[PDB]
Enzyme design. Structure first.
Site, short mmCIF file in Angstrom:
data_model
loop_
_atom_site.label_atom_id
_atom_site.label_comp_id
_atom_site.label_asym_id
_atom_site.label_seq_id
_atom_site.Cartn_x
_atom_site.Cartn_y
_atom_site.Cartn_z
N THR A 141 6.23 11.29 14.30
CA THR A 141 5.83 12.37 13.73
C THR A 141 5.87 13.50 14.28
N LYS A 160 9.06 15.53 14.08
CA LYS A 160 9.20 16.14 12.74
C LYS A 160 8.57 17.45 12.66
N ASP A 203 24.20 10.16 -12.66
CA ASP A 203 22.76 9.89 -13.10
C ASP A 203 22.27 9.01 -11.89
N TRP A 238 -11.15 1.99 -4.28
CA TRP A 238 -9.85 1.40 -4.61
C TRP A 238 -8.99 0.21 -4.00
N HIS A 270 -5.79 -1.43 11.33
CA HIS A 270 -6.48 -0.46 11.85
C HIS A 270 -7.42 -0.07 10.80
N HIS A 271 -7.27 -0.72 9.68
CA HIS A 271 -8.25 -0.42 8.61
C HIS A 271 -9.36 -1.68 8.54
N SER A 324 11.06 19.65 4.61
CA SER A 324 12.19 19.94 5.47
C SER A 324 13.18 21.05 4.74
N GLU A 355 1.54 2.06 2.18
CA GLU A 355 1.55 3.03 1.03
C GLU A 355 1.05 4.36 1.43
N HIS A 405 -11.03 8.06 -9.05
CA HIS A 405 -10.54 9.30 -8.56
C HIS A 405 -9.29 8.92 -7.66
N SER A 409 6.73 -1.03 -12.08
CA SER A 409 7.18 0.63 -12.25
C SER A 409 8.04 0.95 -11.05
N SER A 410 7.12 0.98 -9.83
CA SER A 410 7.67 1.55 -8.72
C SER A 410 8.68 0.47 -8.16
C1 HEA Z 1 -0.69 11.04 3.49
C2 HEA Z 1 -1.60 9.83 4.06
C3 HEA Z 1 -1.95 9.57 5.04
C4 HEA Z 1 -1.05 9.59 6.43
C5 HEA Z 1 0.27 10.26 6.67
C6 HEA Z 1 -2.14 8.80 7.35
C7 HEA Z 1 -1.68 9.01 8.51
C8 HEA Z 1 -2.23 8.36 9.71
N1 HEA Z 1 -3.43 7.62 9.58
FE1 HEA Z 1 -4.31 7.49 8.11
N2 HEA Z 1 -5.23 7.22 6.14
C9 HEA Z 1 -5.25 7.49 5.08
C10 HEA Z 1 -4.08 8.23 4.54
C11 HEA Z 1 -3.05 8.65 5.71
N3 HEA Z 1 -2.96 8.57 6.93
C12 HEA Z 1 -5.83 6.92 4.13
C13 HEA Z 1 -5.89 7.40 2.49
C14 HEA Z 1 -6.94 6.20 4.76
C15 HEA Z 1 -8.24 5.51 4.15
C16 HEA Z 1 -7.84 4.40 3.33
C17 HEA Z 1 -9.68 4.09 2.64
O1 HEA Z 1 -10.29 3.34 3.58
O2 HEA Z 1 -9.59 4.39 1.56
C18 HEA Z 1 -6.50 6.26 5.76
C19 HEA Z 1 -7.14 5.64 7.19
C20 HEA Z 1 -6.65 5.46 8.42
C21 HEA Z 1 -7.49 4.80 9.48
C22 HEA Z 1 -8.46 3.73 9.14
C23 HEA Z 1 -9.78 4.37 9.67
C24 HEA Z 1 -11.03 3.79 9.17
O3 HEA Z 1 -11.15 3.40 8.05
O4 HEA Z 1 -12.26 3.52 9.85
C25 HEA Z 1 -6.86 4.99 10.46
C26 HEA Z 1 -7.22 4.43 11.89
O5 HEA Z 1 -6.24 4.21 12.77
C27 HEA Z 1 -5.53 5.93 10.25
C28 HEA Z 1 -4.95 6.43 11.43
C29 HEA Z 1 -3.70 7.21 10.91
C30 HEA Z 1 -2.79 7.65 11.80
C31 HEA Z 1 -2.62 7.42 13.43
C32 HEA Z 1 -1.84 8.54 10.96
C33 HEA Z 1 -0.54 9.07 11.73
O6 HEA Z 1 0.60 8.47 10.92
C34 HEA Z 1 -0.51 10.45 12.07
C35 HEA Z 1 0.33 10.84 13.01
C36 HEA Z 1 0.54 12.51 13.15
C37 HEA Z 1 0.29 13.24 14.02
C38 HEA Z 1 -0.45 12.53 15.34
C39 HEA Z 1 0.38 14.79 13.80
C40 HEA Z 1 1.45 15.30 14.07
C41 HEA Z 1 1.91 15.15 15.60
C42 HEA Z 1 2.25 15.79 16.61
C43 HEA Z 1 2.09 17.50 16.45
C44 HEA Z 1 2.60 15.40 18.02
C45 HEA Z 1 1.58 15.31 19.46
C46 HEA Z 1 0.42 14.43 18.83
C47 HEA Z 1 -0.06 13.68 19.72
C48 HEA Z 1 0.42 13.46 21.26
C49 HEA Z 1 -1.40 12.68 19.19
N4 HEA Z 1 -5.68 6.27 9.06
C1 HEA Z 2 -3.68 11.93 -3.37
C2 HEA Z 2 -5.10 11.46 -2.86
C3 HEA Z 2 -6.14 12.32 -3.07
C4 HEA Z 2 -6.17 13.44 -3.48
C5 HEA Z 2 -5.13 14.59 -3.70
C6 HEA Z 2 -7.77 13.64 -3.35
C7 HEA Z 2 -8.41 14.98 -3.73
C8 HEA Z 2 -9.77 15.29 -3.57
N1 HEA Z 2 -10.48 14.28 -3.34
FE1 HEA Z 2 -10.46 12.38 -2.69
N2 HEA Z 2 -10.12 10.41 -2.36
C9 HEA Z 2 -8.94 10.04 -2.59
C10 HEA Z 2 -7.67 10.28 -2.54
C11 HEA Z 2 -7.62 11.68 -2.83
N3 HEA Z 2 -8.54 12.77 -3.17
C12 HEA Z 2 -8.99 8.46 -1.99
C13 HEA Z 2 -7.87 7.49 -1.84
C14 HEA Z 2 -10.32 8.35 -1.88
C15 HEA Z 2 -11.27 6.93 -1.29
C16 HEA Z 2 -11.71 6.25 -2.59
C17 HEA Z 2 -12.53 4.95 -2.34
O1 HEA Z 2 -13.70 5.14 -1.39
O2 HEA Z 2 -12.42 3.80 -2.57
C18 HEA Z 2 -11.14 9.43 -1.84
C19 HEA Z 2 -12.36 9.95 -1.74
C20 HEA Z 2 -13.09 11.13 -2.02
C21 HEA Z 2 -14.32 11.39 -1.80
C22 HEA Z 2 -15.36 10.13 -0.95
C23 HEA Z 2 -16.16 9.61 -2.09
C24 HEA Z 2 -17.00 8.91 -1.42
O3 HEA Z 2 -17.02 8.42 -0.30
O4 HEA Z 2 -18.23 8.36 -1.96
C25 HEA Z 2 -14.53 12.73 -2.05
C26 HEA Z 2 -15.97 13.42 -1.67
O5 HEA Z 2 -15.92 14.49 -1.73
C27 HEA Z 2 -13.19 13.18 -2.57
C28 HEA Z 2 -13.16 14.41 -2.84
C29 HEA Z 2 -12.18 15.01 -3.27
C30 HEA Z 2 -11.84 16.32 -3.53
C31 HEA Z 2 -12.83 17.59 -3.81
C32 HEA Z 2 -10.39 16.62 -3.90
C33 HEA Z 2 -9.75 17.97 -4.40
O6 HEA Z 2 -9.31 18.26 -3.26
C34 HEA Z 2 -8.80 17.76 -5.33
C35 HEA Z 2 -8.36 19.17 -6.01
C36 HEA Z 2 -7.18 19.25 -6.84
C37 HEA Z 2 -5.74 19.08 -6.59
C38 HEA Z 2 -5.35 18.57 -5.25
C39 HEA Z 2 -5.03 19.23 -7.78
C40 HEA Z 2 -4.45 17.96 -8.03
C41 HEA Z 2 -3.16 18.00 -8.48
C42 HEA Z 2 -2.46 18.46 -9.62
C43 HEA Z 2 -3.24 19.15 -10.87
C44 HEA Z 2 -1.10 18.18 -9.89
C45 HEA Z 2 -0.29 19.60 -10.31
C46 HEA Z 2 1.05 19.04 -10.76
C47 HEA Z 2 2.21 19.54 -10.54
C48 HEA Z 2 2.40 20.72 -9.77
C49 HEA Z 2 3.48 18.82 -10.95
N4 HEA Z 2 -12.32 12.20 -2.44
CU LIG Z 3 -3.72 2.88 7.45
#
Ligand code: HEA
Ligand code: HEA
Ligand SMILES: [Cu+2]
Ligand SMILES: CCCCCCCCCCCCCCCCCC(=O)OCC(COC(=O)CCCCCCCCCCCCCCCCC)OC(=O)CCCCCCCCCCCCCCCCC
Ligand SMILES: CCCCC/C=C\C/C=C\C/C=C/C/C=C/CCCC(=O)O[C@H](COC(=O)CCCCCCCCCCCCCCCCC)COP(=O)(O)OCCN
Ligand SMILES: CCCCC/C=C\C/C=C\C/C=C\C/C=C\CCCC(=O)O[C@H](COC(=O)CCCCCCCCCCCCCCCCC)COP(=O)(O)OCCN
Ligand SMILES: CCCCC/C=C/C/C=C/CCCCCCCC(=O)O[C@H](COC(=O)CCCCCCCCCCCCCCC)COP(=O)(O)OCC[N+](C)(C)C
Ligand SMILES: CCCCCC/C=C/CCCCCCCCCC(=O)O[C@H](COC(=O)CCCCCCCCCCCCCCC)COP(=O)(O)OC[C@@H](O)CO
Ligand SMILES: CCCCCC/C=C\CCCCCCCCCC(=O)O[C@H](COC(=O)CCCCCCCCCCCCCCC)COP(=O)(O)OC[C@@H](O)CO
Ligand SMILES: CCCCCC/C=C\CCCCCCCCCC(=O)O[C@H](COC(=O)CCCCCCCCCCCCCCC)COP(=O)(O)OC[C@@H](O)CO
Ligand SMILES: CCCCCCCCCCO[C@@H]1O[C@H](CO)[C@@H](O[C@H]2O[C@H](CO)[C@@H](O)[C@H](O)[C@H]2O)[C@H](O)[C@H]1O
Ligand SMILES: CCCCCCCCCCO[C@@H]1O[C@H](CO)[C@@H](O[C@H]2O[C@H](CO)[C@@H](O)[C@H](O)[C@H]2O)[C@H](O)[C@H]1O
Ligand SMILES: C[C@H](CCC(=O)O)[C@H]1CC[C@H]2[C@@H]3[C@H](O)C[C@@H]4C[C@H](O)CC[C@]4(C)[C@H]3C[C@H](O)[C@]12C
Ligand SMILES: C[C@H](CCC(=O)O)[C@H]1CC[C@H]2[C@@H]3[C@H](O)C[C@@H]4C[C@H](O)CC[C@]4(C)[C@H]3C[C@H](O)[C@]12C
Ligand code: CUA
Ligand SMILES: [Mg+2]
Ligand code: NA
Ligand code: NA
Ligand SMILES: [Zn+2]
Lengths: 227, 43, 259, 58, 79, 46, 98, 84, 514
Positions: free
Chosen positions: I316, I319, I91, I126, I290-291, I255, I242, I61, I156-157
């Protein structure tokens, strides 16, 4: 343990876990305020027919919304790091216990004095006794003395696991070749439950942790009886 | 944005067909697998 | 007809044959590691070489023969090559991190020491030092080749480039001999793992870079380069300096400090 | 050797509509067919191998 | 001296969550001490503090593997 | 040259909306069905 | 010591590379490598926009260091004004012998 | 151990050829000498079946599964010791 | 002609189209995998089997959603279509290499599917941590097919990153500085830098896992002196950049959308937006551990990673506030793409804030490896990256196709999806606080109510996905051809009409320097 419809943390069993609850309350208030403020400003920007589409100067306003978030972060970071270091403080345990993760159960070793060790397996659902909890009970509980500082050492003899007890605020990964340390102190007798917290294969969902906190004299007699 | 009227208009009846076919293309194959899960596991 | 200076490339099959070659090489490696067969892997290696050959042939046709490499096009190729080398630097960075992680904190299984008990490293003052002098020398000779080319001197460009290639080949044969003579192997714990995987990827890049210099040598024999326009040579020289610098880091880290 | 780049420039600039990967003449066509045949044939073989490996073999 | 040993005390050389080297060091120290004592016909009883610390800290399977390797001649630490 | 304009800059035909519905149905439907049949396959093994 | 044998671009550049090289010698820019220098932009002194067809897109940066560029099609005929700031532009169509 | 030459009127091909033949290749020749004076086979140490060495978690995909890719019988023992 | 055009392409629009079709198909696969997860958890007990088949589904997934849906759609699809048009370039810099970046992805996807069909699949998460992903606990081909799938997607990327950086630096009009290029272009350039630096490190780590599995190395095996935790460092050195790779092009599209449907000629605070994306890109490389707050790291290290992670909230937040200031005074057009963007602004903020909760390593002890993490990242991914994708898709579909969507259906689709995703993920906060672990196929009974609700939410989102397919069908079925688009003076990518001709900017734009 967790209970049905629970919204927040399990009740604190250790002073550290109580500290975490108050810090989480502090942080959650900020999260609610900022998220509410954003939702509200969105609605305000969207609810008027008045317009102003010419170019808008940005310098003055970006001070505000850099400096205020920096301040808020610092108000989070200060109590966060205080708890961090207090969790690291020296405390002088009076007992060390080791736990080794395995696929899929925990073993425990209490070797300060005698060679005491045993395995601890989930009770199958078909064998629960009435009133016992599905997926949480074990056959051999980790008996420990209440109101004392315990050193827990965590490792694994196969893949990664992680040894967690949420109501004591504990989660320490179980890594083969590595001996990780944490400190445990229960303010109360009772039964405290946790679950393996690192994906470890086919029965990761089914290798729980049960601590049984009793007075020191009971722990000693239990320990003797487990040799 | 502005646009021309449809060159090949899709009536409500035609939209109901397209939407029904679309939904069934997702639902029937998954439904078939999930309906038979027991026969797969009990095997 | 265009009035910008950039290159609209003819539709080409080589992206697809390259992508399929990548499928064949990776499913080939899977078949070899798990199903005791080299067939898919040999097909993938073959189509990969054919793809590289025809693709870069076509780039030569587009530039030397058809004139599409204006200054703007060349500038883009310079950026592309620099970015490519940056990505390769980060790739090696991961293997250096692995080396330092293991050697700075040697575990009990190793004897709690580095080098591990039972490991007898090569003497870094013998062949490894010779290798260092060989690649450093090849950095001097390729610089001579570059200046000769810029000064319009065909014979000395060819001589200096031949010397550079000869040194590259000398490094490769010395390293092959050292591999054979080494008393430790890739299965000798993390010492053998880091040593052979890091120097082994470096060795592959030395082979790649030597091949690129050899392409340049034959292109020069065929008069493709002008005194001002010779980006394939420039890129091969950059790549060659990258390979020389990665070696110096390996020598200091793994061979010397890690001994 | 002699500089024959001018001759190659004439060849590859000839107004014959051919894409650059075939503009060398008939040998380009052969090497192209060999490459594409190995890639497409190899890819089918790899699918066969997936099919084989997708089931146990006692 | 220090009897009424309860468990291994805090040791400033190993102040962090990773205690592997603490177990390892006391295991080495105990067996180093025991080799020195048994050779010069002394008493291994002076090695006791190391013995209690390593038994408290080290996983049973680590001690057992290490003991097996000492007997085999494959223990990679210096004793 | 190549065809240009709406409906012509895509690798699938939109000349008949019902053939298009069938194509889209196979295309998105095959992607959505694949994990269910992979699960079935793994269950039928063991 | 010293000898020759390496072709020059003057001798061997071909195709578009050669066209660019030869025009540059003449100070000409048929392939748009350089940014054109602005006139005053008045209706009397409009910016003169070369084209090989009868329309071309103009981007107008109204004030120095604006990050916003204003884009519009300039068509053959009477000078047109940039929508944002009024600067005048006039198309000067030709064949690529320019 | 610093440098100390001193040219630089305007770097050119003549100077880099001078460096190539006057410093770079003589260095290689000197290290080639040094190396061919310390060639000669060291005596192989006692085999000890250390468990962190001669790892085998899966057979190698060549040969009998138990020989490394550039196995040298003289200096590379198998997990069971040197070959006869 | 068909093979020349679509298999041998050297054209940035057609390759962009290929990526959009590929990512849409991947999105179906990843959606089905997500419904299998939530079916398993939708009532207590075991539906499918034990944690192995369950976590093959979970693992796939994530790889599908990340590597075959989000990144191909944002970078390969919107990037290739929009970036050359937004800078007036004819292009991409390397138009033929561009095509190989596309064509590496179907084989990468095939290898991942093969991994799940052979043996018992890769049930690793993953993150593919050893020793579970090693050759004793995951014997056989599945994990190696996964590694190779990642290799090809990585190549690819990396080549696409080289292409995008080169194109954006080298192929603007000679008068246009980097500070006159649109924010979506900035967002692609910065994402490409992050890809260039981070993917080689992932490649190094997974190659070490491959050799530990097959060549008897021991990088991660304590028996040889290796360390499983080194794998985690290498993986997360890639893995935190990533997630900024996954969100930054989304920020760029947001934006443009907010600016456009506010009737504004420019976003508020353009240089602050550039600064914020660059700052995010940079800070995103210094926070990875932090992971790893529960693996046993020294306290001072945890203090550092706590503090550095929280800093990212400052750029952030600029933004977010700048988007709100772009809406301010707008003539608001309540188009479907605007609704997606407004939902983005709010739900992304919630997920960012829960990420700041997790940044506190003391609290993360209790939240790590629980559904609180799952809730954080699905707020930024399913309600952030995906909402930006849907917003960009509805906004630019008329440009790419020449046809209009039915806006009423697109608003219905947004409404359904908004309910479904919030119903799915909001209760997961409660499950995480109360201690439900990640990667579980079943849970203690107390956790039933929120799991039941979460699974019902996932079916609502399924209905939205099905409706989306119908909506695209209806647009191509009805063939409403675009006539006029507003605001072309500040949205160059529309100025060549809908769809633009195969070759655009054969004659480049005229921009003077003055
Ligand atoms: C789009 C994907 C995305 C983005 C943008 C982020 C953004 C951030 N994430 Fe992440 N994160 C994931 C996808 C993402 N994350 C995924 C997939 C994992 C799990 C991976 C895995 O284990 O599988 C994960 C896990 C993860 C962890 C590990 C937790 C754990 O495994 O125990 C942590 C811990 O610090 C973290 C922190 C953050 C923080 C601080 C940001 C910051 O970038 C967010 C900053 C944004 C704001 C704060 C909101 C806007 C701000 C304002 C309105 C300003 C005022 C706010 C304050 C004064 C606080 N993330
Ligand atoms: C982009 C990243 C992404 C997205 C979109 C989602 C979407 C969803 N995920 Fe995701 N999920 C992960 C990344 C994501 N997940 C990751 C990284 C993990 C951790 C894996 C791990 O533990 O190893 C995870 C784990 C995770 C779990 C935890 C499993 C576990 O700990 O046992 C669950 C459980 O409910 C969950 C549920 C869902 C559901 C219900 C959605 C639904 O919201 C999805 C609904 C459908 C959409 C959002 C449509 C999808 C898009 C299209 C059809 C594209 C259309 C195309 C064009 C318009 C050009 N996901
Ligand atoms: Cu992180
Ligand atoms: C935020 C995304 C959108 C919201 C989506 C769902 C909206 C509905 C709910 C949601 C309605 C908004 C109110 C949110 C909190 C509600 C529950 C609570 O009491 O939370 C308590 C705590 C800890 O709890 C304790 O230790 C004390 C328990 C006290 C018990 C007393 C009884 C309380 C009432 C019972 C709750 C009912 C369950 C709700 C079940 C909800 C299921 C869906 O849990 C937690 O930390 C949860 C952590 C969530 C962090 C994300 C914050 C985002 C907020 C956005 C708000 C802006 C305006 C919304 C305006 C909303 C419109 C956009
Ligand atoms: C296992 C064995 C090794 C395996 C192979 C390893 C690598 C081999 C690398 C390639 C070697 C190729 C050699 C090519 C040599 C070219 C000779 C022909 C060209 C030439 O001889 O040119 C002359 C340079 O000569 C010259 O002595 C060139 C002389 C080169 C000298 C090399 C080193 C030997 C010198 C011993 C001196 C020791 C000094 C020590 C002190 C040093 C203090 C710095 C310049 O003359 P010109 O009049 O200006 O003419 C211009 C037209 N050519
Ligand atoms: C200059 C001297 C020669 C240098 C070059 C030699 C060949 C290297 C070829 C490729 C290098 C690439 C991967 C490196 C993998 C390990 C090879 C390490 C270098 C080497 O050759 O190591 C040899 C072992 O080779 C072995 O296992 C088997 C080696 C062959 C199998 C390689 C397996 C394929 C691995 C593919 C990795 C994935 C590709 C990376 C993708 C990156 C995507 C961005 C060492 O021999 P030994 O007998 O153990 O000890 C010597 C004792 N007398
Ligand atoms: C979660 C995030 C929130 C955290 C907290 C953030 C709080 C932010 C609060 C900020 C309030 C700032 C308000 C500024 C509004 C006042 C300026 C304005 O709106 O007016 C404009 C000023 O523009 C000028 O030059 C000067 C430049 C343009 C000024 C207008 C743009 C500034 C708008 C800021 C909008 C913020 C929107 C909400 C974001 C949170 C126009 O004024 P003039 O007199 O020149 O023309 C008038 C013509 N006369 C002279 C004939 C009358
Ligand atoms: C770079 C290409 C050429 C390289 C040639 C080699 C150059 C040396 C660089 C590396 C220097 C550190 C190497 C350390 C190696 C171990 C020796 C050591 O570290 O020795 C120590 C002094 O080292 C010390 O680096 C003292 C510092 C060493 C200085 C060496 C001389 C060069 C300094 C000037 C360099 C020129 C300027 C460069 C531009 C900035 C102390 O002496 P020991 O012998 O330990 O005796 C102790 C007794 O109890 C043993 O019985
Ligand atoms: C045993 C292992 C086998 C498999 C691995 C690979 C094997 C060998 C690969 C060797 C690489 C050879 C590359 C030959 C490139 C020739 C084409 C060329 O050099 O093209 C030049 C453009 O440069 C350009 O594209 C620059 C093109 C740069 C491409 C090369 C960069 C090296 C890539 C190697 C792949 C590394 C992968 C490593 C992974 C761990 C043409 O322009 P000019 O030179 O200015 O000429 C024009 C003048 O004539 C006008 O007057
Ligand atoms: C586990 C086993 C996995 C194996 C996976 C292997 C996967 C890939 C199969 C690769 C087949 C390669 C075929 C040759 C590709 C040559 C690309 C090239 O040389 O691209 C050039 C641009 O890239 C540039 O310069 C600079 C970039 C040159 C890149 C050369 C190719 C590198 C391929 C490997 C990349 C990853 C290396 C490691 C990074 C960690 C030219 O761009 P084009 O658009 O063509 O033309 C533009 C025209 O104007 C030229 O006249
Ligand atoms: C997570 C995504 C899945 C969402 C849920 C799908 C919703 C419903 C889809 C309907 O699927 C069909 O349902 C039938 C039952 O209603 C099944 O017929 C089955 O049951 C019938 C009645 O018992 C028999 O007539 C048939 O032969 C037998 O195949 C049929 O195969 C299946 O295609
Ligand atoms: C133009 C496209 C090209 C497509 C070509 C398709 C070629 C198909 C040839 C079939 O080859 C099979 O694969 C293995 C080798 O080829 C053989 O297995 C064997 O092969 C190995 C030989 O090295 C041994 O190691 C193993 O014991 C054993 O499984 C097997 O008998 C053979 O039938
Ligand atoms: C100097 C630079 C570009 C200005 C321009 O040339 O247009 C601007 C753009 C964004 C600005 C930054 C952002 O507005 C964020 C911060 C705002 C604070 O008020 C000052 C520091 C702060 C970090 C700013 C410093 C500086 O003014 C920046 C970095
Ligand atoms: C024949 C050719 C002259 C160049 C030209 O005018 O064609 C000469 C000039 C430089 C020569 C090369 C260089 O002198 C370097 C090499 C020197 C070796 O002794 C012979 C092969 C070697 C590779 C030479 C081969 C060949 O005789 C070359 C290539
Ligand atoms: Cu043990 Cu999960
Ligand atoms: Mg964990
Ligand atoms: Na040069
Ligand atoms: Na279940
Ligand atoms: Zn203007």
């Amino acid at each position: 343990m967790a209970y049905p419809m629970q919204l927040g943390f399990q009740d604190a069993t250790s002073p550290i876990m109580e500290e975490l609850l108050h810090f989480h309350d502090h942080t959650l208030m900020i999260v609610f305020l900022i998220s509410s403020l954003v939702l509200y400003i969105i609605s305000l920007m969207l609810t008027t027919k008045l317009t102003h589409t010419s170019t808008m100067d940005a310098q003055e306003v970006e001070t505000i919304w850099t400096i205020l978030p920096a301040i808020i972060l610092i108000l989070i970071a200060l109590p966060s790091l205080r708890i961090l270091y207090m969790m690291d403080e020296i405390n002088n345990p009076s007992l060390t216990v080791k736990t080794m993760g395995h696929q899929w159960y925990w073993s425990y070793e209490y070797t300060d004095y005698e060679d005491l060790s045993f395995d601890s397996y989930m009770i199958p659902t078909s064998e629960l006794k009435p009133g016992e909890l599905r997926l949480l009970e074990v056959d051999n509980r980790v008996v420990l003395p209440m109101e004392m500082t315990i050193r827990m050492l965590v490792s694994s003899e196969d893949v990664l696991h992680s040894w967690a007890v949420p109501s004591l605020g504990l989660k320490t990964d179980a890594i083969p070749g590595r001996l990780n340390q944490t400190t445990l102190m229960s303010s109360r007798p009772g039964l405290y439950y946790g679950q393996c917290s690192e994906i470890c294969g086919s029965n990761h969902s089914f290798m729980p942790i049960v601590l049984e906190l009793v007075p020191l004299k009971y722990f000693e007699k239990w320990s003797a009886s487990m040799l | 944005i502005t646009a021309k009227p449809a060159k090949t208009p899709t009536s409500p009846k035609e939209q109901a067909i397209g939407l029904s076919v679309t939904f069934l293309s997702f639902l029937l194959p998954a439904g078939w697998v999930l309906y038979h899960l027991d026969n797969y596991k009990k095997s | 007809h265009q009035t910008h200076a950039y290159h609209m490339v003819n539709p080409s099959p080589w992206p697809l044959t390259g992508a399929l070659s990548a499928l064949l090489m990776t499913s080939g490696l899977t078949m070899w590691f798990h199903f005791n067969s080299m067939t898919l892997l040999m097909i993938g290696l073959t189509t990969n070489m054919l793809t590289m050959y025809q693709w870069w042939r076509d780039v030569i046709r587009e530039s030397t023969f058809q004139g599409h490499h204006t200054p703007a096009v060349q500038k883009g190729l310079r950026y592309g090559m620099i970015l490519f080398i940056i990505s390769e630097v980060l790739f090696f960075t991961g293997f250096f991190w692995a080396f330092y992680h293991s050697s700075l904190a040697p575990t009990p299984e190793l004897g709690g020491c580095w080098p591990p008990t039972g490991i007898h490293p090569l003497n870094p003052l013998e062949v490894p030092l010779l290798n260092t002098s060989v690649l450093l020398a090849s950095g001097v000779s390729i610089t001579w080749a570059h200046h000769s080319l810029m000064e319009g001197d065909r014979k000395h460009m060819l001589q200096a480039l031949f010397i550079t290639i000869t040194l590259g080949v000398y490094f490769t044969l010395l390293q092959a001999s050292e591999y054979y003579e080494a008393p430790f192997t890739i299965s000798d714990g993390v010492y053998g793992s880091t040593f052979f995987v890091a120097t082994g990827f470096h060795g592959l890049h030395v082979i790649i870079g030597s091949t690129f210099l050899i392409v340049c040598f034959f292109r020069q024999l065929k008069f493709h380069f002008t005194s001002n326009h010779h980006f394939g040579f420039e890129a091969a020289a950059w790549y060659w300096h990258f390979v020389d610098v990665v070696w110096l880091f390996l020598y200091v880290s793994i061979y010397w400090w890690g001994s | 050797f002699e500089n024959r780049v001018a001759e190659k420039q004439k060849l590859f600039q000839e107004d014959n509509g051919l894409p650059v990967h075939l503009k060398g003449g008939a040998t380009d066509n052969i090497l192209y067919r060999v490459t594409m045949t190995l890639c497409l044939g190899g890819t089918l073989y790899s699918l066969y191998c997936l099919g084989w490996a997708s089931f146990p073999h006692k | 001296k220090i009897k009424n040993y309860q468990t291994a005390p805090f040791d400033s050389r190993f102040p962090n969550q990773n205690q592997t080297r603490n177990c390892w060091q006391n295991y080495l120290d105990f067996h180093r001490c025991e080799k020195a004592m048994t050779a010069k016909g002394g008493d291994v009883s002076v090695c006791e503090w190391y013995r209690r610390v390593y038994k408290s800290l080290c996983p049973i399977s680590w001690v057992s593997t290490w003991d097996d390797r000492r007997a085999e001649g494959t223990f990679p630490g210096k004793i | 040259h190549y065809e240009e304009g709406p409906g012509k800059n895509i690798p699938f035909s939109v000349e008949n909306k019902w053939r298009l519905l069938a194509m889209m149905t196979l295309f998105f439907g095959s992607g959505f069905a694949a994990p269910f049949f992979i699960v079935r396959h793994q269950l039928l093994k063991k | 010591a010293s000898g020759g044998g390496v072709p020059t671009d003057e001798e061997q550049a071909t195709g578009l590379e050669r066209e660019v090289m030869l025009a540059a010698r003449k100070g000409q820019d048929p392939y748009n490598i350089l940014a054109p220098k602005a006139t005053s932009g008045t209706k009397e002194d409009p910016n003169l926009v070369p084209s090989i067809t009868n329309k071309r897109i103009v981007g107008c940066i109204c004030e120095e260091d604006n990050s916003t560029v204003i884009w519009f099609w300039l068509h053959k005929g009477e000078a047109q004004r940039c929508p944002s700031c009024g600067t005048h532009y006039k198309l000067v169509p030709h064949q690529l012998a320019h | 151990a610093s440098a100390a030459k001193g040219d630089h009127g305007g770097t050119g091909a003549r100077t880099w050829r001078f460096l190539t033949f006057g410093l770079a290749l003589p260095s290689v020749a000197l290290c080639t000498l040094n190396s061919w004076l310390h060639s000669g086979h060291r005596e192989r140490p006692a085999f000890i079946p250390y468990h962190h060495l001669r790892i085998r978690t899966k057979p190698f995909s060549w040969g009998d599964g138990n020989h490394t890719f550039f196995h040298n019988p003289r200096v590379n023992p198998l997990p069971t010791g040197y070959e006869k | 002609m068909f093979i020349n055009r679509w298999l041998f392409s050297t054209n940035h629009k057609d390759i962009g189209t290929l990526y959009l079709l590929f990512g849409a198909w991947a999105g179906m696969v990843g959606t089905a995998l997500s419904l299998l997860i939530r079916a398993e958890l939708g009532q207590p007990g075991t539906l499918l089997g034990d944690d192995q088949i369950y976590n093959v589904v979970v693992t796939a997934h994530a790889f599908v959603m990340i590597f075959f849906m989000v990144m191909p759609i944002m970078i390969g699809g919107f990037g290739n279509w929009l970036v050359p048009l937004m800078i007036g370039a004819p292009d991409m810099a390397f138009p033929r290499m561009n095509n190989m970046s596309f064509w590496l992805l179907p084989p990468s996807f095939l290898l991942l599917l093969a991994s799940s069909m052979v043996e018992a699949g890769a049930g690793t998460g993953w993150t593919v941590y050893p020793p579970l992903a090693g050759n004793l606990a995951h014997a056989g081909a599945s994990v190696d097919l996964t590694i190779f799938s990642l290799h090809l997607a990585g190549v690819s990327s990396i080549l696409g990153a080289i292409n995008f950086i080169t194109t954006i630096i080298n192929m603007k009009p000679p008068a246009m500085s980097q500070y006159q290029t649109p924010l979506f272009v900035w967002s692609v350039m910065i994402t490409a830098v992050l890809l260039l630096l981070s993917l080689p490190v992932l490649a190094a780590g997974i190659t070490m896992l491959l050799t530990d599995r097959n060549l008897n190395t021991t990088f991660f095996d304590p028996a040889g002196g290796g360390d499983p935790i080194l794998y985690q460092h290498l993986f997360w050195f890639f893995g935190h950049p990533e997630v900024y790779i996954l969100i930054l092009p989304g920020f760029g599209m947001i934006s443009h959308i907010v600016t456009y449907y506010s009737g504004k000629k420019e976003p508020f605070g353009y240089m602050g937006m550039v600064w914020a994306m660059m700052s995010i890109g940079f800070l995103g490389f210094i926070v990875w551990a932090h992971h790893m707050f529960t693996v046993g790291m020294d306290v001072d290290t945890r203090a550092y990673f706590t503090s550095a992670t929280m800093i990212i909230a400052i750029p952030t937040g600029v933004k977010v506030f700048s988007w709100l200031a772009t809406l301010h005074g707008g003539n608001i057009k309540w188009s479907p793409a605007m609704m997606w963007a407004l939902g983005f602004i709010f739900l992304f903020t919630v997920g960012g804030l829960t990420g700041i909760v997790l940044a506190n390593s003391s609290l993360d002890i209790v939240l790590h490896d629980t559904y609180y993490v799952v809730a954080h990242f699905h707020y930024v991914l399913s309600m952030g990256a995906v909402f930006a994708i849907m917003g960009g898709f509805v906004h630019w579909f008329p440009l790419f196709s020449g046809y209009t969507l039915n806006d009423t259906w697109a608003k219905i689709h947004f409404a359904i999806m908004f309910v479904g995703v919030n119903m799915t993920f909001f209760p997961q906060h409660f499950l995480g606080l109360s201690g439900m672990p990640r990667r579980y196929s079943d849970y203690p009974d107390a956790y039933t109510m929120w799991n039941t609700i979460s699974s019902m939410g996932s079916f609502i989102s399924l209905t939205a996905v099905m409706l989306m397919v119908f909506i695209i069908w209806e647009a191509f079925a009805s063939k409403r051809e675009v006539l006029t688009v507003d605001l072309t003076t500040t949205n160059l990518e529309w100025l060549n009409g809908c769809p633009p001709p195969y070759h655009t900017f054969e004659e480049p734009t005229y921009v003077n320097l003055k």
